Design a protein around this nucleic acid. Structure first.
Length: 845
RNA sequence: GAUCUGAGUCCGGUAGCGCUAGUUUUAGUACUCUGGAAACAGAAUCUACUAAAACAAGGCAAAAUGCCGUGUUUAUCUCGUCAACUUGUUGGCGAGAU
DNA sequence: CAGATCCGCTAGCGCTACCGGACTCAGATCT
DNA sequence: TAGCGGATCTGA
């Protein structure tokens, strides 16, 4: 309808937008789009977890396979009990002496339990004494050439009293050697075939390789290593369809050499290009003779002085180096025969196999599959070859055409490609009115910048739909430098050009932006709010106005900012905290969680003394076996003013605090249990633990959403936890039984139906005040955590400068008058919304 | 100044494979009382060590052996179409609601 | 009963493949 | 990775 200049202030957590009229030169509308910062830590934690689960599942499956092996030979049965057997003593006995089949099974299962590290027996480094594994097992291996793993572990068990810890890391080769000696001794007495020993040793020593990955039933798996490398490697810079060539292919190295030789500038020829018959001679007398060509040796072939040579690439003060064909010389040494050397395609295939396949056994198999001329011995020699990794940026076909052209003409690669006329094509389809959001995914960015760009693209789409095609689009960026910015503008320019509705896209300069902000008065203070980002976008468009066209600016006084917050309705997230707590019934009859008090001998840690001063009965050692408590409390009161008597007592005696003993042999105490506050909100894990005397729970269960119900005037509130959502087929469905049960506790009438359903960062209007919901604080206490939409509560309190903690909790009780649900579009327009009836299905994909 | 190419260093990712640990329970041993006027273990379950087994709730798979589960996108409603393996949720157009 | 105050939340390495960026150098084309 | 899930505790 009306032309305008649109400013954008892309941040990590915010995309502020500002729309300034081209004619009146004043703001039409400005707003902010708030979203939680994308963090590499989130996905790295998810992947770290996925890997830990696979590790734990792999270990359990290996234990189960070992158990099946023991069953098939009747060594271990369901009637036998591993319990009561010390596996360390059993292993040390088995290395030299016969042992029973149940104790044999105990030793074998313990060996299969801990296998040792494989990454270190390949590469091990040692520097004195350190908290590293590569050095710890260095020291252990020093202690191993004398004795096996089990004997050293048992010796440590007698010396320090314990085996487990950082001291207990060893190599898989040591474990395999010990197990092999154990099995060699044991196979005489027991009925064990050779095949059983090899099967067990594979179970002990076998792990997946990094190129083999999970089972191909996984979404993360791959059928073959060739396909694994195919999806891994990039695509050609000119031919998107074509995959990159491996950088040590013979044609790629020839291409690089030809490129170098064309950069050569010779004066005696009075021309800048080198001759063809001369370049071929150089390449056939220097590059094919030396592993690394030398410019001085090139001077001999060119028959001209070195200072006449110019244009060679050089790195700092080093010699002028040229790109050399390592594959050609490597094949040349192992194979003197010239049919392999002559056939460049053979070197290309050999280099591709060497780069693709990570194992030497795989390389030999695929070299045999090549059915080439050279005999199997040279196949083994190539298999032993190493140093081939990475990919050349160009594809093999592009390299072939380019080198065929480079043999004759001395033009650089860009000129040859321009004469080859490959014209870039814009990836956007243009058949969608909105900017495609897939382009941001296409570009490689930091996760924070990628999410900010997606939000910015949707903001641009909404503005174009609401107001019309911008006259100009103007962008800033907080993170990513100017590189990500230029990618965003390449996207936007490509879309506008291909769709023929071209709009200028410009990024105002950071120095010029600072100059503009310094001009006049734009005060920046702490606790400004998101209106700060909105004002920055307005100032960005303001900067553009100065460049192309400051009196009576509406930017000075504009209390019309609209704040849009992203709503997170994504199911299946972190359900519950990973810590497992033990509970204990008190005298009264309430279930109390048990908390351990760690770091007793720490100067900074003074909790143990506070817990004694508050109430000593909270300590479990006061109630049970009180004499060590009385000794500890004598130590406690003796120091008094000292903040942590435990560390001081240990320092004076030289040893940590030990539990009371008349023989003075009592064990040292590292942690102390005390009684915690009673818990109502918990998840029972006690079923996992048979015959558990006391109930063991996980805590802090995360809510998904809460539905506000209204019966007979009083407002109710039902919480749907992340544990109540379960996945089937392609979708997520909340549990009907769990929802009905949770409705029973809140005792909502059957005739009542709910006002609305609230997800995280959803707008709610309680008693005429509108805040966005953070989450339900207490399900039983009927309180929900909220936050102010325009400014975060912490910043508002900091301006308010009060003592009260920055946290607002609202109670949905019998006294609240109204509850309303509001939604804002991405632009920030706020709407009262109508609710559906009881959402129990959410789609995935 | 910005694309392209290739020599390096230095950071950041995405996936994969493993290591030792951590929380908890059970069992055993130590240690704590008790008969003990003797043998024996009755309690206590606090403090350590060792083992096995459970670690986001769970869901698949059949053991001819293995896989998934903590991220990425997402304002709400009606409207006639079109899938989903045919009821309520989702591809797309319209329309409301500040 | 309504805020305020108090209190916890798994962890270190150790490799691998391929993708990206900044830099600095030697030369291409575009603006 | 500093916000979230909660329990206590004073007013009473």
């Amino acid at each position: 309808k009306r032309n305008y200049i649109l400013g954008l202030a892309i941040g990590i957590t915010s995309v502020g937008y500002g729309i300034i009229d081209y004619e009146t030169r004043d703001v039409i509308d400005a707003g902010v789009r708030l979203f939680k910062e994308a963090n590499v830590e989130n996905n790295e934690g998810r992947r770290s977890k996925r890997g830990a689960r696979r590790l734990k599942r792999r270990r359990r499956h290996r234990i189960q396979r070992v158990k099946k092996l023991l069953f098939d030979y009747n060594l271990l049965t369901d009637h036998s009990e591993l319990s009561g057997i010390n596996p360390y003593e059993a292993r040390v006995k088995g290395l030299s002496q016969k042992l029973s089949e149940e104790e044999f099974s105990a030793a074998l299962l313990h060996l299969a339990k801990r296998r040792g590290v494989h990454n270190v027996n390949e590469v091990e480094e040692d520097t004195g004494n350190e908290l590293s594994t590569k050095e710890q097992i260095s020291r252990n291996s020093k202690a191993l050439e004398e004795k096996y793993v089990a004997e050293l572990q048992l010796e440590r068990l007698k010396k320090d009293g314990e085996v487990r810890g950082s001291i207990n890391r060893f190599k898989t080769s040591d474990y395999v050697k010990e197990a092999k000696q154990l099995l060699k001794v044991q196979k005489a007495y027991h009925q064990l075939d050779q095949s059983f020993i090899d099967t067990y040793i594979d179970l002990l020593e076998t792990r997946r390789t990094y190129y083999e990955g999970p089972g191909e039933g996984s979404p993360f798996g791959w059928k073959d290593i060739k396909e694994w490398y195919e999806m891994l490697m990039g695509h050609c810079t000119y031919f998107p369809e074509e995959l990159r060539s491996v950088k040590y292919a013979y044609n790629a190295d020839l291409y690089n050499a030809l490129n170098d030789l064309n950069n050569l500038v010779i004066t005696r020829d009075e021309n800048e290009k080198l001759e063809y018959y001369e370049k071929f001679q150089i390449i056939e007398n220097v590059f094919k003779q030396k592993k690394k060509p030398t410019l001085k040796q090139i001077a001999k072939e060119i028959l001209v002085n070195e200072e006449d040579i110019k244009g060679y690439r050089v790195t700092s003060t080093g010699k002028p180096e040229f790109t050399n064909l390592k594959v050609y010389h490597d094949i040349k040494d192992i194979t003197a025969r010239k049919e392999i050397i002559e056939n460049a395609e053979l070197l290309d295939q050999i280099a591709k196999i060497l780069t693709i396949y990570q194992s030497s056994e795989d390389i030999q198999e695929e070299l045999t599959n090549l059915n080439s001329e050279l005999t199997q011995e040279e196949i083994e020699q190539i298999s032993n070859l190493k140093g081939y990794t990475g990919t050349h940026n160009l594809s093999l076909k592009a390299i072939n055409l380019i080198l065929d052209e480079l043999w004759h003409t001395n033009d650089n690669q860009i000129a040859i490609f321009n004469r080859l006329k490959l014209v870039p094509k814009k990836v956007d389809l243009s058949q969608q009115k909105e900017i495609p959001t897939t382009l941001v995914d296409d570009f490689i960015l930091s996760p924070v910048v990628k999410r900010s760009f997606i939000q910015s693209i949707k903001v641009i789409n909404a503005i174009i739909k609401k107001y019309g095609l911008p006259n100009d689009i103007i962008i800033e960026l907080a993170r990513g430098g100017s590189y990500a910015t230029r990618g965003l503008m390449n996207l936007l320019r490509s879309y506008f050009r291909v769709n023929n509705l071209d709009v200028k896209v410009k990024s105002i300069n950071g120095g010029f932006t600072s100059f503009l902000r310094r001009k006049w008065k734009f005060k920046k203070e702490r606790n400004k709010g998101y209106k700060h980002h909105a004002e920055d976008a307005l100032i960005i468009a303001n900067a553009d106005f100065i460049f192309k066209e400051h009196q009576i600016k509406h930017i000075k006084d504009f209390k019309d900012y609209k704040y849009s917050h992203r709503v997170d309705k994504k199911p299946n997230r972190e359900l519950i905290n990973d810590t497992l707590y033990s509970t204990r019934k008190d005298d009264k009859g309430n279930t109390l969680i048990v908390n351990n008090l760690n770091g007793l001998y720490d100067k900074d840690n003074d909790k143990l003394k506070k817990l004694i001063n508050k109430s000593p009965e909270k300590l479990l050692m006061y109630h049970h076996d009180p004499q060590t408590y009385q000794k500890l409390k004598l130590i406690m009161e003796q120091y008094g003013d000292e903040k942590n008597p435990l560390y001081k007592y240990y320092e004076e005696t030289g040893n940590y605090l030990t539990k009371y003993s008349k023989k003075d042999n009592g064990p040292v105490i590292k942690k102390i249990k005390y009684y915690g506050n009673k818990l109502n909100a918990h998840l029972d894990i006690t079923d996992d633990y048979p015959n558990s005397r006391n109930k063991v729970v996980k805590l802090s269960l995360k809510p998904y959403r809460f539905d506000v119900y209204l019966d007979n005037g009083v407002y109710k509130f039902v919480t749907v936890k992340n544990l109540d959502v379960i996945k089937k087929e392609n979708y997520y469905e909340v549990n009907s039984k769990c929802y009905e049960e949770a409705k029973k506790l809140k005792k909502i009438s059957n005739q009542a139906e709910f006002i609305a359903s609230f997800y995280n960062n959803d707008l709610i209007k309680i008693n005429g005040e509108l805040y966005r919901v953070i989450g339900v604080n207490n399900d039983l206490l009927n309180r929900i955590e909220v936050n102010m939409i325009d400014i975060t509560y912490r910043e508002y309190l900091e301006n308010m400068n009060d003592k009260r903690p920055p946290r607002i909790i609202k109670t949905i009780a019998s006294k609240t008058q109204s509850i309303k649900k509001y939604s804002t579009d991405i632009l920030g327009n706020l709407y009262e919304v109508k609710s559906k009836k009881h959402p129990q299905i959410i789609k995935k994909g």
